[PDB]
Amino acid sequence: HMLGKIALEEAFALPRFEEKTRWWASLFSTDAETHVKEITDINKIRIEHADKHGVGYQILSYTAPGVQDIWDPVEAQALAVEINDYIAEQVRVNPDRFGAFATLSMHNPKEAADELRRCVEKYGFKGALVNDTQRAGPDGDDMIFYDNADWDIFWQTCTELDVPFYMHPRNPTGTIYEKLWADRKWLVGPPLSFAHGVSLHVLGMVTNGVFDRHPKLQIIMGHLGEHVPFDMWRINHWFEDRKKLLGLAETCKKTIRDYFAENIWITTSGHFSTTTLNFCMAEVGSDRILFSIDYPFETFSDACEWFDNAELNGTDRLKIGRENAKKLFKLDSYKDSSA
Amino acid sequence: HMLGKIALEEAFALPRFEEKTRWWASLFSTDAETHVKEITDINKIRIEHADKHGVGYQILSYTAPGVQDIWDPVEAQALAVEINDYIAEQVRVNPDRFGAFATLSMHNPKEAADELRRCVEKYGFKGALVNDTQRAGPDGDDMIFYDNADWDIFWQTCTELDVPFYMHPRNPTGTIYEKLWADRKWLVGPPLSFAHGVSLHVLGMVTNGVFDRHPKLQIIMGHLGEHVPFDMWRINHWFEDRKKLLGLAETCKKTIRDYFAENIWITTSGHFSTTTLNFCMAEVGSDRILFSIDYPFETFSDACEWFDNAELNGTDRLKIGRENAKKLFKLDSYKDSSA
Amino acid sequence: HMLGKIALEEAFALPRFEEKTRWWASLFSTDAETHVKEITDINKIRIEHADKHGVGYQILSYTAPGVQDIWDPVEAQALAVEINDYIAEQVRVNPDRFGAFATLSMHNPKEAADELRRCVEKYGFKGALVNDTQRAGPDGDDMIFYDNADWDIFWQTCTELDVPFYMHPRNPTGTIYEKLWADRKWLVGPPLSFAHGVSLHVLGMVTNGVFDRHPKLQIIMGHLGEHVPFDMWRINHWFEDRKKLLGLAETCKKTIRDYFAENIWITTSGHFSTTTLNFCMAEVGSDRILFSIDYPFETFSDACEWFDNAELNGTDRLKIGRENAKKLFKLDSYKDSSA
Amino acid sequence: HMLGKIALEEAFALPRFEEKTRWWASLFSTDAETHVKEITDINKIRIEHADKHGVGYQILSYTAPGVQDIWDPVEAQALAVEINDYIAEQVRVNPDRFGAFATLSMHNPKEAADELRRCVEKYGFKGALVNDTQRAGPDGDDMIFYDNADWDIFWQTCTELDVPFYMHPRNPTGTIYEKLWADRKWLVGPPLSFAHGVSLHVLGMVTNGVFDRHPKLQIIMGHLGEHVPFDMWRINHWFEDRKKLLGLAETCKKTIRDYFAENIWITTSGHFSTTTLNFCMAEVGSDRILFSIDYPFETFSDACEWFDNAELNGTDRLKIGRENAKKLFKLDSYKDSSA
Ligand SMILES: [Mg+2]
Ligand SMILES: [Mg+2]
Ligand SMILES: [Mg+2]
Ligand SMILES: [Mg+2]
Ligand SMILES: [Mg+2]
Ligand SMILES: [Mg+2]
């Protein structure tokens, strides 16, 4: 029904990574051959789906774990550059249907900032999408988080370009995988592990002052906010009435509710629940919620049939379906953008 | 207003552990001296609070991390026995106001089963409360989870005695603490880390078949279910429409919704939110929700003023406030139990 | 999808009233020919629909306005008797799938009490369904309400037999129709007028003490309670904090919430909204909510595809879909009643 | 706690009408002496309350039933003019804290249009507030509704001036009162009758095409929309899937949801329920909801302690508390308007 929807947690993979794509599909797809075709296609199948389901514009991003899985920094950087150059060429075929987020190696703040800048200035990319922490160390068992002073140069590039950063999940790896997940491996990914990573990282940015140093910064979480809205009351209470009397206020100057009003966005990717959406409208506000699909891990049909037919007031259907994202991403037109 | 409420996430500590109690208070209390007094008191201050706030009956349990912090199995077992003997003596002073959960060393299934049995048969304890995984290994850096075949003898003791098991959180420790939490330490405890542990463990029990082998088993989570209700739609979708087509069905025979209807309970401890309660009533059902406080980490006043004054239908106020727990714990009377 | 559902706002009309059936259908059906066939059929089409949509048992009642439109008391009573004798014979064809509510002339309390008793004792009817006030007076411009002492003999018959009374709507007529509805006639029926009538009458029963004199009496409203749950807070406030200090307490001894917990039920007829259902769960409680369809004004498909696919915890899906009604109507087994 | 809130269902009475004030207070106040003082005071007590409770600006309007109770058109028009002249002088004492809605005789469209224009152009009033239908006829038993072509000249004046019209309730009178309310009189006012009147009139405006002929017109309902949001699903279904196929489309060209997105607003007057507010956020959207109090029928303390402490995201707290009304009424600065 609604046309001109915007989706922005929508993944692609390079054709040359077929073995890696099949491994990820073995965990998260029930049809590996269709998955390979869909995750690598840009301008045919994806357009056909979008045309059937009222999706005017998609901001595309690299599949997880993507560059965040690559612990050799030279290899990781070369891969990010390769991906960005590739997708820029592909989305030129349909500029009224596609934009792109930058894919980044996050081993080094300045390097990541320069590549984001190249993507925005040269190609008109819409922001960055990164799959949680950067794998690092000689065998990839370490993790680089971005919630510290090293990353100020990077966050300032985001605010200067005035583009958002999407904190996407990745799988647990190395010792964390072995200690917590291997004996309950069916919880890896959407059932639990993904949200544990993203919520940790974003709440780390909150409590380490990233949004105080960079109050213009916009961070996006998928999956209706990776559990955080469920605990908005509890986090707020344990911040304002507990931890902020014990030292948290030194590095965290606003409430969790303020950060969701001013800095944080959530999307509907992979979480096609009107009951949960309504609860998020209460705890986060419809102005801060964006439609998204999570293709090809989720189908256009599941996401769009859900959203198009959900019981919702017309004002919020318009905002969540497209108008919030239109404003955030400064889109002056695209296919069906005012339908 | 409502009298005869039951609370059952209510902690005590042994007087001899004053230094340890002060350390935990330094993280989670804004008034260490009052905290020490309240966590060690059983029969004076706690009764005064309950009398003011309409709490008829409290099931008491040992503070976290408690015995789960003790990696020497001989020491841990001796401590559990000591705690159970102690609290049995203390609650004899007010048997119409207090019951107790067993405190257990969870290093060994048979040992834990025998001590639970002793507590139930000798002292009339109401179940077990355990602070997530058992610390183990020479320096306590390993973790023992209970979602595997070793623990069948223990879960069968729970179902034979027909008493529930409360999966309470504990703090992250060792390598997990260093890798994930030390650089964002204000998230330790109620803001995030606690729920990550409990949800992992309980969803591990689900996906490893514990509730299929032990369909009578009742597991309780605090804090409105440690995020799980927020993702009921998403977990259910990623189980029934994804992982159960890839191998999960071999060890997981019912839906996540079935397990919440048949095996899992949530309490309101530390989560005094009518908006979130309403959402949990939708996703879990009021029949499966129990009032609780989380004293002395939370105050009676905060929990009871919230619940007593929350907008709620009378049927569910009665059930959540006491009648659900009255039935689950087979309470035929206690102070104000039918007021 | 759930089997063995119970629906109980399910209408029929006598074959000899085709003209009246067509007049009503001209207001409320988009396919009059199908409507005529469906509202008169009992044992064929209704079973075809119920078999496709998981409805095990239907409690049938007479179409609105039915006997309540008949202001001649002799004609009205004869019609009620005729209808009850008719439907008792029809349900005997397939008693495993159908029960019936009594149809009554409500001109005279004793007369209506005697006919309800005959229906329960002779035919095993499940209660009464009445279309709001009884038209009366020489030209049918008066209306008989049941919220006064003259009706005590009738309400005592309901409680003695221990069967519920379903307060169904009827159209506005006479002077009320001309003054309020004729100039906005598209609001007649489900859009507004029906709920105005039923809510007035039931809240009349509340404020005139019917449920105080007859505390066992069970009253059922369709359409998720005819707006009343929306104003549960506002009614409760304007009773307990206002009118109960000005004289209402003389004739109304409990709160509106008490009456919903003890006396009043709501059904899902004609209101296939999960968002509104959730809100009713909060304001009324799932123990007091019954599935129903409103056939043939609504389709089995709309009601059952909604309910069967609604996001809902399994506990409440079972209660609302059948278990609440199984208990309330003391039902023997019926098709799929324990599926 | 939020400062600079705007309230706009805030009543006053003329000092010379003490007897009428006391009669109304005998129905709707538990402290008549305080009520008399509060409803007549403008500039002292109202400011004391607003200063304590974070209310920066109050748009005042005339008490119900007000001019709508006056069936002599000459007396009614003279009274409306008197009231507007009176309140314009009162608000000039403290214009930073107060504005006013026009009080109108609604016997004649052109007359009411001319008086609304005088109030806006001469006094800077913010719109009109009218207590439902105008009593009329020789004995006041008739009622004038505004949902027809005779009122086009009036609705065009509202859109030309670009000011809203607040449809406030009044009591039932005359034949309607005797037939429906006299025997259940405790339902008169906030418990039920008020909402029945307003919802009828506004849904009359919908179904008679007022918002099609006047698409810019803004209509406001108090009391969270006078039940209408509860039936948003049911009305929409019975319009789009039923009545719109039977003739309603001839006079009603959009959906009920479209009219709530484009034309209709709701306020929180007298309905201090977060659960119901959340439901209205879903069904109507926070962009269309305005804080209000209903003083002096409700207290500042009840309304403001509720709203200031309600669990709500910060985006919507700001919009509902003041920013929606600041935009709708084109407000200059007032006390704490940007606090
Ligand atoms: Mg190949
Ligand atoms: Mg994704
Ligand atoms: Mg000491
Ligand atoms: Mg605790
Ligand atoms: Mg019906
Ligand atoms: Mg008012």
Author numbering:
A (entry chain B), B (entry chain B), C (entry chain A), D (entry chain A): 0 to 338
Show sentences the authors wrote:
The divalent metal‐dependent enzymes are capable of catalyzing the reversible non‐oxidative (de)carboxylation of a variety of electron‐rich (hetero)aromatic substrates analogously to the chemical Kolbe‐Schmitt reaction. All of the metal‐dependent decarboxylases identified so far are members of the amidohydrolase superfamily, which share significant structural and mechanistic similarities, such as a (β/α)8‐barrel fold harboring one catalytically essential divalent metal ion in the active site. The mechanism follows an electrophilic aromatic substitution in analogy to the Kolbe‐Schmitt reaction: First, a divalent metal ion chelates the carboxylate and phenol group in the o‐position, which facilitates protonation at the ipso‐carboxylate position by a highly conserved Asp residue, thereby breaking aromaticity as the rate‐determining step. Subsequent cleavage of the C−C bond yields CO2 and phenol as products.
The structure of recombinant 2,3‐dihydroxybenzoic acid decarboxylase of A. oryzae was solved by X‐ray crystallography to 1.2 Å. The catalytic metal shows well defined density complexed by Glu8, His167, the proton donor Asp293 and three water molecules. Interpretation of this density as the expected Zn2+ vastly overestimated the electron density. In contrast, Mg2+ gave a perfect fit. The B factors at full occupancy refined to 18.9 for Zn2+, 17 for Mn2+ and 9 for Mg2+ compared to the envelope B factor of 12. The highest rate was found with protein incubated with Mg2+, which was approximately 2.5 times higher than the one treated with Mn2+ and twice as high as the control sample without any additional metal ions. For the Mg‐enzyme complex, the protonation of the substrate by Asp293 was found to be rate‐limiting, with a calculated barrier of 15.8 kcal/mol (TS1Mg), and the formed 2,4‐dienone intermediate (IntMg) lies 8.8 kcal/mol above the enzyme‐substrate complex (E:SMg). The activation barrier for the Mn‐enzyme complex using the same active site model is calculated to be 2.0 kcal/mol higher than Mg‐enzyme, which agrees well with the experimentally measured trend discussed above. To summarize, crystal structure elucidation and metal analysis by ICPMS/MS supported by mechanistic quantum chemical calculations have identified Mg2+ as the catalytically relevant metal in the active site of 2,3‐dihydroxybenzoic acid decarboxylase from A. oryzae.
